[PDB]
Write a protein that binds this DNA or RNA. Structure first.
Lengths: 36, 17, 59, 50, 125, 59, 38, 252, 50
RNA sequence: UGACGGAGCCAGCGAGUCUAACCUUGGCCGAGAGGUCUUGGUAAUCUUGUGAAACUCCGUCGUGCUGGGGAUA
């Protein structure tokens, strides 16, 4: 009610492709840098 | 031997049904 | 439906030409302007449609 | 009350754009002024109405 | 509202419609300019209606050509036929008849297949 | 037609025979196809469908 | 192996040629991808 | 909860000993777990393989297998920036686009392509129009079924276009993730196969550990779009090589 | 319809081939609005509607 | 007149509620018929329309044939 009173008185997402959000790979910090 | 055990198990399950 | 070929239907007589109108792809101004009423009016529209199709199918 | 406020501000914006279009198609000399973004406006010639 | 003229150029199954009207001088084939008409070795087959009579005839008119059908060389022959007889028909209708038949004489002295195709064939011997 | 025969020798034995679909569309077997063995080419009264069965009534 | 890929194969120093033949002798521990070699 | 007991270890050992000696399966080198869920998992099968993250065993490095990459219409940007980067310049066996892919490979060329590669990876904007281009050989079963990748780390807003760039470090990171993890595809019924481990690149405790990893990620409650699909009691596990019988584990 | 196309007789004038017209591919344009209305409406009509 | 590797481009035919594979690995439900899911292999002039190939352009190479058991890593 405090946020609603302030208003009243003041993870990828492709739009065309809904299969991307289960599709794409969960990349890590251990994946981007070192020797392959 | 467990391989032959379980394939005989599914075989006689279908035969019994 | 009867799908008459374009090579035939471009070479048809003037009386025999087939009036086939293309669909509209542009959100024209009169269609984006025109108002439809809601609630009691949309259930009146639904009711009149149900009555008219029951009458036509009975006939 | 909050969604009454959202409906009222969206109606104010769409009536403001409608009024700008209506004001634009009356008469007088005018030019299309383009800003940094692409929000266009129409600046009217300094000429009073006869 | 504008003085405009429409002609047709045909070879085997290519066909080109040319609209000529008064303008600033732009010659456009299929939306792109005339200086893009491939196969680029027959671009002078397309150009010769311009170079046979001078660009001062084209300095006041704008042509547009729409070419469908055919292949590469049939399309360049349709383009050059459409351009040639469109220039002749424009100078007939909206410029004087003396420049009209001067253009007809120049194109016919080069080759009359700029103006009249060879259309119905074979011969049953 | 796929499988009423096992070999092109069998189809060669049965060439020219009149078959029919279950729709009563009459037909005739014409020639054994080469690479798939019991498959042959038949000609019918008109276009048969993929949901049909041809029939060679023998005794 | 850092040898320039435009040199003709005659003018090769022996450390360059031994680097070439060492890489082609043990491709796995030089992490060459396994689809290059069959 | 925890699935590592003598039943699981004996079944998996006996499967390896069977496939070493049996002359009917000396070509398929793979272990799959069949999860028999309790209920029917409701989500229909699109052919998009969701990614099951293994926690401590990279089952494949991106250099020990052939990778085909399928790109958008002009393909010059992706081909140049992928092949002269030297973060990714040797990682792909092939980079093509959909137009000339369906131009070149028609008919038995697709069977040669199937036997040629073993990781098909498509741009996610073209991943959906692949089952006509690649045929049904890539979509019957699931061993060469193509993976979605995002090539640019950029998101599309409405009323404006995705700026066409690509990021080679990002695409190496997600191919590393794809080869490092395993995958599954949801369907309607209660059967679900997940590939876990190889026949000589792996061993019994690591295969058992990543089996338990896939179990945890699948019957988890969070990670709900990607992984939380087993809503009910997971009833049975089986292990099999593709021509081998279903050795049972965890009959609940 | 194929026989009528073979027997078109191209010296066929009607008075309705002033109003009726033909697209680029040669087929018939049928205006999907009216034929008792007009598709484009005038500037003062647009002023009143807006 | 080649071989690799990219790119530009140009047709006319053809529209029946009709157009189109096979063999397996297993899970679950069912009395059964079967259903549904899963899985590897083989075959392929794909599937209805958009699109052809020869052609054109741009980088790269560089013109003396084919075999199995033997034998070197």
């Amino acid at each position: 009610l405090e946020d609603i009173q302030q208003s009243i008185l003041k993870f990828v997402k492709d739009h065309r492709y809904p299969g991307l959000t289960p599709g794409l790979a969960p990349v890590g910090l251990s994946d981007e840098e070192d020797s392959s | 031997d467990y391989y032959q055990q379980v394939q005989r198990g599914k075989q006689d399950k279908k035969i019994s049904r | 439906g009867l799908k008459v070929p374009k090579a035939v239907q471009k070479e048809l007589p003037f009386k025999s030409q087939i009036h086939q109108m293309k669909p509209q792809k542009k959100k024209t101004y009169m269609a984006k302007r025109a108002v439809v009423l809601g609630g009691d009016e949309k259930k009146a529209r639904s009711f009149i449609q149900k009555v008219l199709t029951i009458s036509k199918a009975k006939d | 009350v909050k969604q009454h406020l959202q409906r009222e501000t969206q109606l104010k914006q769409v009536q403001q754009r409608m009024d700008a279009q209506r004001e634009l198609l009356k008469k007088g000399s005018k030019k299309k002024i383009v800003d940094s973004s692409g929000k266009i406006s129409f600046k009217w010639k300094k000429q009073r109405k006869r | 509202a504008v003085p405009s003229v429409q002609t047709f150029g045909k070879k085997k199954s290519a066909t080109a419609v040319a609209h000529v009207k008064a303008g600033k001088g732009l010659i456009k084939v299929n939306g792109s300019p005339i200086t893009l008409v491939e196969p680029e070795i027959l671009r002078f087959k397309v150009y010769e209606p311009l170079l046979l009579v001078g660009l001062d005839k084209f300095s006041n008119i704008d042509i547009r050509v729409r070419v469908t059908g055919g292949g590469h060389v049939s399309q360049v022959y349709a383009i050059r036929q459409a351009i040639a007889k469109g220039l002749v028909a424009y100078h007939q209708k909206y410029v004087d008849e003396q420049s009209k038949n001067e253009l007809k004489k120049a194109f016919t002295s080069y080759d009359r297949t700029l103006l009249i195709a060879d259309s119905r064939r074979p011969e049953p011997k | 037609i796929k499988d009423m025969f096992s070999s092109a020798m069998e189809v060669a034995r049965f060439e020219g025979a009149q078959i029919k679909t279950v729709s009563g569309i009459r037909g005739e077997i014409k020639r054994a196809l080469s690479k798939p063995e019991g498959h042959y080419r038949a000609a019918f009264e008109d276009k048969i469908l993929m949901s049909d069965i041809v029939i060679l009534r023998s005794w | 192996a850092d040898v320039d890929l435009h040199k003709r194969a005659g003018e090769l120093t022996q450390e360059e040629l031994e680097r070439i033949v060492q890489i082609m002798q043990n491709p796995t521990h030089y992490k060459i991808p396994a689809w290059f070699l069959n | 909860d925890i699935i590592k007991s003598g039943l699981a270890e004996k079944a998996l050992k006996a499967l390896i000993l069977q496939c070493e000696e049996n002359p009917s399966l000396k070509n398929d080198k793979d272990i799959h777990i069949i999860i028999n869920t309790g209920k029917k998992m409701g989500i229909n099968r699109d052919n998009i393989p969701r990614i099951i993250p293994l926690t401590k065993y990279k089952l494949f490095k991106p250099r020990d297998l052939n990778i085909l990459l399928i790109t958008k219409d002009p393909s010059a940007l992706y081909r140049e920036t992928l092949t002269k980067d030297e973060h990714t310049s040797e990682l792909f066996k092939e980079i093509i686009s959909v137009k000339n892919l369906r131009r070149r490979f028609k008919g038995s060329k697709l069977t040669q392509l199937y036997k040629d590669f073993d990781l098909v990876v498509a741009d996610y904007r073209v991943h959906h129009l692949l089952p006509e281009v690649l045929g049904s050989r890539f979509y019957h079963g699931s061993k060469k079924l193509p993976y979605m990748i995002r090539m640019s780390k950029e998101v599309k807003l409405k009323r404006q276009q995705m700026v066409e760039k690509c990021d080679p470090i990002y695409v190496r990171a997600q191919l590393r993730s794809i080869c490092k993890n395993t995958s599954y595809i949801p369907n309607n019924d209660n059967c679900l196969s997940v590939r876990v481990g190889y026949i000589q690149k792996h061993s019994i405790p690591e295969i058992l550990q990543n089996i338990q990893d896939t179990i945890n990620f699948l019957t988890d409650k969070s990670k709900r779009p990607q992984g939380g699909v087993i809503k009910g009691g997971i009833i049975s596990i089986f292990v099999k090589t593709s021509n081998s019988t279903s050795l049972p584990i965890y009959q609940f | 319809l194929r026989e009528k196309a073979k027997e078109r007789n191209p010296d066929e004038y009607y008075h309705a081939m002033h109003s009726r017209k033909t697209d680029a591919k040669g087929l018939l344009i049928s205006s999907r609005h009216g034929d008792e209305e007009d598709e484009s409406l005038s500037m003062d009509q647009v002023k009143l509607l807006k």
